[PDB]
Design a protein around this motif. Structure first.
Motif, PDB file in Angstrom:
ATOM      1  N   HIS A  12       0.803  -1.211   0.000  1.00  0.00           N
ATOM      2  CA  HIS A  12       0.000   0.000   0.000  1.00  0.00           C
ATOM      3  C   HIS A  12       0.834   1.258   0.000  1.00  0.00           C
ATOM      4  O   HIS A  12       0.302   2.354   0.109  1.00  0.00           O
ATOM      5  CB  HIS A  12      -0.899   0.036   1.226  1.00  0.00           C
ATOM      6  N   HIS A  13       2.148   1.111  -0.124  1.00  0.00           N
ATOM      7  CA  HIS A  13       3.058   2.214   0.146  1.00  0.00           C
ATOM      8  C   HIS A  13       3.171   3.187  -1.016  1.00  0.00           C
ATOM      9  O   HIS A  13       4.064   4.040  -1.022  1.00  0.00           O
ATOM     10  CB  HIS A  13       4.426   1.662   0.528  1.00  0.00           C
TER      11      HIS A  13
ATOM     12  N   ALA B  32      15.431  -1.913  11.842  1.00  0.00           N
ATOM     13  CA  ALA B  32      14.510  -3.028  11.944  1.00  0.00           C
ATOM     14  C   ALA B  32      14.475  -3.815  10.639  1.00  0.00           C
ATOM     15  O   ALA B  32      15.138  -3.477   9.660  1.00  0.00           O
ATOM     16  CB  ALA B  32      13.111  -2.535  12.296  1.00  0.00           C
ATOM     17  N   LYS B  43      10.900  -5.399   5.203  1.00  0.00           N
ATOM     18  CA  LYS B  43      10.480  -4.034   5.499  1.00  0.00           C
ATOM     19  C   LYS B  43      11.562  -3.448   6.397  1.00  0.00           C
ATOM     20  O   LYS B  43      11.455  -3.500   7.624  1.00  0.00           O
ATOM     21  CB  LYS B  43       9.113  -4.012   6.170  1.00  0.00           C
ATOM     22  N   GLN B  45      13.876  -0.431   7.829  1.00  0.00           N
ATOM     23  CA  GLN B  45      13.832   1.005   8.044  1.00  0.00           C
ATOM     24  C   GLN B  45      14.980   1.465   8.920  1.00  0.00           C
ATOM     25  O   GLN B  45      15.933   0.721   9.157  1.00  0.00           O
ATOM     26  CB  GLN B  45      12.522   1.414   8.697  1.00  0.00           C
ATOM     27  N   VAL B  47      14.466   2.979  12.435  1.00  0.00           N
ATOM     28  CA  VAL B  47      13.493   3.393  13.434  1.00  0.00           C
ATOM     29  C   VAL B  47      14.150   4.333  14.428  1.00  0.00           C
ATOM     30  O   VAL B  47      15.315   4.153  14.794  1.00  0.00           O
ATOM     31  CB  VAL B  47      12.915   2.177  14.158  1.00  0.00           C
ATOM     32  N   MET B  49      14.358   5.096  18.204  1.00  0.00           N
ATOM     33  CA  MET B  49      14.089   4.235  19.343  1.00  0.00           C
ATOM     34  C   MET B  49      13.859   4.991  20.641  1.00  0.00           C
ATOM     35  O   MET B  49      13.323   4.410  21.588  1.00  0.00           O
ATOM     36  CB  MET B  49      15.232   3.249  19.541  1.00  0.00           C
TER      37      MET B  49
ATOM     38  N   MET C   5       0.952  -7.863  15.561  1.00  0.00           N
ATOM     39  CA  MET C   5       1.495  -8.544  14.396  1.00  0.00           C
ATOM     40  C   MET C   5       0.413  -9.211  13.567  1.00  0.00           C
ATOM     41  O   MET C   5       0.621  -9.451  12.376  1.00  0.00           O
ATOM     42  CB  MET C   5       2.510  -9.596  14.834  1.00  0.00           C
ATOM     43  N   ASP C   9      -3.202  -5.806   9.127  1.00  0.00           N
ATOM     44  CA  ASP C   9      -3.340  -6.580   7.903  1.00  0.00           C
ATOM     45  C   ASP C   9      -1.983  -6.853   7.267  1.00  0.00           C
ATOM     46  O   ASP C   9      -1.157  -5.954   7.093  1.00  0.00           O
ATOM     47  CB  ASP C   9      -4.256  -5.859   6.917  1.00  0.00           C
ATOM     48  N   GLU C  11       0.758  -7.816   4.318  1.00  0.00           N
ATOM     49  CA  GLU C  11       1.050  -7.092   3.084  1.00  0.00           C
ATOM     50  C   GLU C  11       0.725  -5.608   3.190  1.00  0.00           C
ATOM     51  O   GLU C  11       0.535  -4.942   2.168  1.00  0.00           O
ATOM     52  CB  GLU C  11       0.290  -7.672   1.888  1.00  0.00           C
ATOM     53  N   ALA C  12       0.634  -5.082   4.407  1.00  0.00           N
ATOM     54  CA  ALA C  12       0.416  -3.660   4.596  1.00  0.00           C
ATOM     55  C   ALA C  12       1.243  -3.068   5.721  1.00  0.00           C
ATOM     56  O   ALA C  12       1.404  -1.847   5.764  1.00  0.00           O
ATOM     57  CB  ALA C  12      -1.067  -3.380   4.871  1.00  0.00           C
ATOM     58  N   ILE C  13       1.782  -3.884   6.622  1.00  0.00           N
ATOM     59  CA  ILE C  13       2.423  -3.351   7.813  1.00  0.00           C
ATOM     60  C   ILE C  13       3.839  -2.937   7.473  1.00  0.00           C
ATOM     61  O   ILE C  13       4.453  -3.464   6.541  1.00  0.00           O
ATOM     62  CB  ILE C  13       2.412  -4.367   8.968  1.00  0.00           C
ATOM     63  N   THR C  14       4.370  -2.006   8.249  1.00  0.00           N
ATOM     64  CA  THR C  14       5.751  -1.586   8.149  1.00  0.00           C
ATOM     65  C   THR C  14       6.326  -1.717   9.546  1.00  0.00           C
ATOM     66  O   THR C  14       5.570  -1.665  10.526  1.00  0.00           O
ATOM     67  CB  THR C  14       5.858  -0.142   7.642  1.00  0.00           C
ATOM     68  N   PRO C  15       7.634  -1.908   9.679  1.00  0.00           N
ATOM     69  CA  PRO C  15       8.200  -2.020  11.024  1.00  0.00           C
ATOM     70  C   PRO C  15       7.942  -0.783  11.848  1.00  0.00           C
ATOM     71  O   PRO C  15       7.787  -0.874  13.070  1.00  0.00           O
ATOM     72  CB  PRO C  15       9.688  -2.232  10.748  1.00  0.00           C
ATOM     73  N   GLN C  16       7.855   0.375  11.196  1.00  0.00           N
ATOM     74  CA  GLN C  16       7.518   1.604  11.901  1.00  0.00           C
ATOM     75  C   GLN C  16       6.145   1.503  12.544  1.00  0.00           C
ATOM     76  O   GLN C  16       5.896   2.084  13.603  1.00  0.00           O
ATOM     77  CB  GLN C  16       7.560   2.784  10.942  1.00  0.00           C
ATOM     78  N   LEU C  18       4.823  -1.477  13.378  1.00  0.00           N
ATOM     79  CA  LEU C  18       4.885  -2.534  14.379  1.00  0.00           C
ATOM     80  C   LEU C  18       5.571  -2.074  15.659  1.00  0.00           C
ATOM     81  O   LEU C  18       5.038  -2.268  16.755  1.00  0.00           O
ATOM     82  CB  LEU C  18       5.596  -3.751  13.810  1.00  0.00           C
ATOM     83  N   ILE C  19       6.740  -1.466  15.547  1.00  0.00           N
ATOM     84  CA  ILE C  19       7.516  -1.073  16.715  1.00  0.00           C
ATOM     85  C   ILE C  19       6.812   0.060  17.445  1.00  0.00           C
ATOM     86  O   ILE C  19       6.528   1.108  16.858  1.00  0.00           O
ATOM     87  CB  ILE C  19       8.928  -0.650  16.299  1.00  0.00           C
ATOM     88  N   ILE C  21       7.787   2.315  20.737  1.00  0.00           N
ATOM     89  CA  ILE C  21       8.910   2.578  21.624  1.00  0.00           C
ATOM     90  C   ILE C  21       8.480   3.048  23.003  1.00  0.00           C
ATOM     91  O   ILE C  21       9.289   2.981  23.940  1.00  0.00           O
ATOM     92  CB  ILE C  21       9.857   3.617  21.003  1.00  0.00           C
TER      93      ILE C  21
END
Lengths: 159, 49, 50
Positions: A12-13, B32, B43, B45, B47, B49, C5, C9, C11-16, C18-19, C21
């Motif tokens: 989706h990016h 990450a 994916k 990046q 990040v 922290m 996680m 959804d 095929e849409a998530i980014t580590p940004q 997910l994480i 802080i």
């Protein structure tokens, strides 16, 4: 199909460019991962060349696709009945579909709303993100500048 | 998966931290990495922290 | 991470996305302040500081 410098859309990016294809092997198989990095997310994403269309990556929209999406943003009144929460789930699904036509329908519905009544915070954030991704797509489909595309939007929204 | 913790320079020098009550610190960046087994992607990046 | 996680959804998530802080930053900040091993530097002369 794909090569270096391919201005490419990625669900989706949105829009992003490829830098190269690395000859990496996974499970005894030297797959040809294409290394792609997006501008909006600010991240790189490498993927096998094979599963490109399967994950959903796509060439940028051609000019006739642009014409069709304008025609979809100039679409008729056809609307959903009561239960705005039902339509919230609906158009959120539409956004998740990542299709330019459906996203344009999303932004047009929210435009006819916020022009007339006035959204809520979640509604406005929805319309904002949708308009963001759609502006990115249009700017890189016409091969033009950022504000130019939003101006084309507001002027096409008007008709 | 994570990796590569790197510190940029501090944001405020010591004396000015002590003056304005700024806690003398420095940002963490952590490269990450997200990988889907079923289809296969990354994916990656930088990040904050 | 593993919580959202799956709620997110694929095929849409980014580590940004997910994480998060905030627990890390809260843990650190509640360590240096308000923890009986993080003390005021007892400095009423160089020797006590040392």
């Amino acid at each position: 199909i794909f090569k270096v410098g391919d201005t490419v859309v990625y669900p989706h990016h949105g829009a992003a460019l490829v830098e190269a294809i690395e000859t990496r092997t996974i499970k005894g198989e030297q797959k040809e991962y294409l290394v792609l990095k997006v501008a909006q997310g600010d991240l790189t994403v490498r993927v096998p060349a094979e599963n490109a269309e399967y994950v959903g990556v796509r060439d940028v929209v051609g000019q006739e696709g642009l014409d069709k999406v304008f025609q979809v943003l100039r679409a008729p009144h056809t609307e959903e009945p009561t239960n705005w929460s039902r339509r919230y789930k609906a158009n959120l699904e539409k956004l998740a579909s990542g299709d330019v036509n459906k996203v344009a329908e999303v932004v047009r519905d929210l435009w006819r709303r916020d022009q007339e009544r006035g959204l809520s915070a979640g509604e406005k954030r929805m319309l904002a993100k949708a308009r963001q991704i759609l502006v990115g797509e249009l700017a890189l489909a016409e091969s033009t500048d950022d504000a130019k595309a939003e101006t084309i939007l507001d002027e096409v929204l008007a008709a | 998966s994570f990796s590569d913790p790197r510190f940029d320079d501090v944001k405020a020098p010591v004396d000015e931290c002590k003056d304005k009550d700024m806690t003398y610190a420095a940002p963490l960046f952590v490269t990450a990495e997200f990988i889907n087994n079923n289809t296969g992607e990354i994916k990656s990046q930088t990040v904050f922290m | 991470v593993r919580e959202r996680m799956t709620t997110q959804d694929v095929e849409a998530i980014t580590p940004q996305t997910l994480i998060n802080i905030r627990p890390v930053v809260a843990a650190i900040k509640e360590f240096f302040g308000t923890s009986q091993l993080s003390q005021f530097m007892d400095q009423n002369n160089p020797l006590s500081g040392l």
